[model samples]
Target: ADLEDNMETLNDNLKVIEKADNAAQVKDALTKMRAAALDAQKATPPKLEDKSPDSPEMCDFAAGFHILVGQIDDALHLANEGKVKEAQAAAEQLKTTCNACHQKYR
Candidate 1:
């Protein structure tokens, strides 16, 4: 349940982006998403709990998680520069990335 709650928090922020009007609004949501993403990085997915934290599987998970964080940072930068559509595009990529990771690891 640990990761589930954090994932929900990230999802909530992502949903905000769909209806957000301005760059400031999108950036605010992205900032919250960044926090949730970082928090999730520290967590072990339920399916991976039996694996060694340093195991290749765990390492792969960590690497994927870092990618998510990086994407968020990139989106944040776009939003900060007031590139709303570009930022939103980046956010859409975030969702696709998350889906790919889930397909592999969930």
Candidate 2:
């Protein structure tokens, strides 16, 4: 289904995220995944028994997307500032958020 399709894109982009070991690569990954995250932000989340797909669940998921973007942006900035460890730490947050959402919804 749609969730699977979207998560496919996410997982592929995550491969890029996962392989970043330096500033240039991290910058590239964040830029690419930022757009991917935007696309995901626009997609409707799957409905659960208590959650309406078109309402707050949708908003909540989009907020999570925005937060992911913010974290990635922070990582990219830290990378550009030559703070590689900080960037990696921020990206660790990115992965953690991804895991949480993937576990709860996907």
Candidate 3:
């Protein structure tokens, strides 16, 4: 249920990005969503206590999620500062980060 809620929030933010009139508007929504993503991360359950090979996978997923959110935040910050081109590039990279993780884990 938590995962579903988080993914829904992410999907909504992506829609906001798609509808954004300009880079500034996209950046604003991205910044807000980035914080929400971080909060979602904090709310996620920790890995099981058992020491098993799956631990690595769980850790990687967590780390990837963090990195993805950070990339989005960085891109939004750059866009807010009027670096639209750079921000766009960063946003693409952020998307790749998310894709890579989802491809591997989700």
Candidate 4:
């Protein structure tokens, strides 16, 4: 449920980024998204709970989770720099990382 809540936050803010009218709006959304991603990064997928935390599979899962949060951070950096177009592009990249994780965990 913790991961689900964070995922919801990330999803909601991602939609905000899509509908944002300006750099400031996008920046706000990305800020929240970054926080959500950071929170979710430590979460273990239900399917993976049987595995040891430091198992190779979990390590890979953690690496993938890290990539998603890292991508959010990258997008936030662009938003902070007032590069709306670039930030949006970075947001698009967010989906690729998200889907790859979902493929295995969702």
Candidate 5:
């Protein structure tokens, strides 16, 4: 619930950053969002209780979720550093990772 709340807040901040007129404001927002994502990644997998290998959902959720979150964090960092096109491309990859995990495990 806490991670979800943080993700929601990050999404809202991203929307504001997307429309920000100045680079500095956008960069700041991106930095905050990235930090939140990092926090989310750290908070997620370790708290999972299911340990059976037969439970792919639990395994994937625990093991694979962080990969995509890490990618998103990297993209946000790149975006904040003024690598706009690279960041956008990385975002596309990150979205694919997110959707693929959801389709397979969620």
Candidate 6:
């Protein structure tokens, strides 16, 4: 729920990035994502009484989380290279992945 709640902030940042006419705004967006991604990477998942530690849900979430981080990294790489379109596409992919996981697990 928290990640979902922050979608707007992410999109707002992306919009700022997409409309940026210079390198500084793009760097700002990349820097913001880096900070957020690091914080998110260290977050703990919930423990459910109904599910065991080795359950498929847990495994799938772990995979999804890694993929999401990879996408964020890709986006940052593209942004740094001034591949703005590619970076935004990677961010879109990240959003899509998050939505898929939320639908499956939330």
Instruction: Give the higher-TM-score candidate: 1 or 5.
Output: 1
The residue-by-residue lDDT of candidate 6 on 1-106, one tens digit each, is 2553344455577677767775556767766765554454343455433675577876676676677667777877777788777776776677687688768765
Error (Å) of candidate 3 at residue 13 is: 1.6
Model 5: how far is 60 from its true place, Å? Answer: 3.1
Estimate TM-scores for all models.
Answer: 0.93, 0.75, 0.71, 0.91, 0.55, 0.64
Candidate 2 lDDT over 25-104, as tens digits, reads: 77776677777787777766655446666667666787888888888788889878877667767777777889877776
What TM-score quantifies how close candidate 4 is to the native fold? Answer: 0.91
lDDT of each: 0.88, 0.72, 0.68, 0.85, 0.61, 0.65
In the range 23-96, model 5's lDDT, one tens digit per residue, is 45655665666666566544434335455554665656645547756766776677677777666556556557
Of the candidates numbered 3 and 4, which has the greater TM-score value? 4
By TM-score, is 2 or 4 better? 4
Considering lDDT, where higher is better, how would the candidates rank from best to worst?
A: 1, 4, 2, 3, 6, 5
- Write the residue-wise lDDT of candidate 3 on 1-106 in tens digits: 3665776767777667665567777787677667666665544343433434457766676687788787887877887888766676676566677688667756
Segments of candidate 5 deviating more than 4 angstroms? 42-59, 62-65, 104-106
Better of 3 and 6 by lDDT: 3
Ranking of models by TM-score: 1, 4, 2, 3, 6, 5
Which residue runs of candidate 1 sit more than 4 Å off their true CA positions?
none
Predicted structure 3, TM vs. truth: 0.71
Candidate 4 C-alpha lDDT tens digits along 1-106: 3899989998998888988877899988988877777777788879898999889878888788688877878887888889998899999889988898889888
Q: Which ten residues in a row have the lowest lDDT in candidate 1?
A: 1-10
Which stretches of candidate 4 lie above 4 Å from their native place? none
Against the true structure, whose lDDT is highest? 1
lDDT of 6 at 56: 80
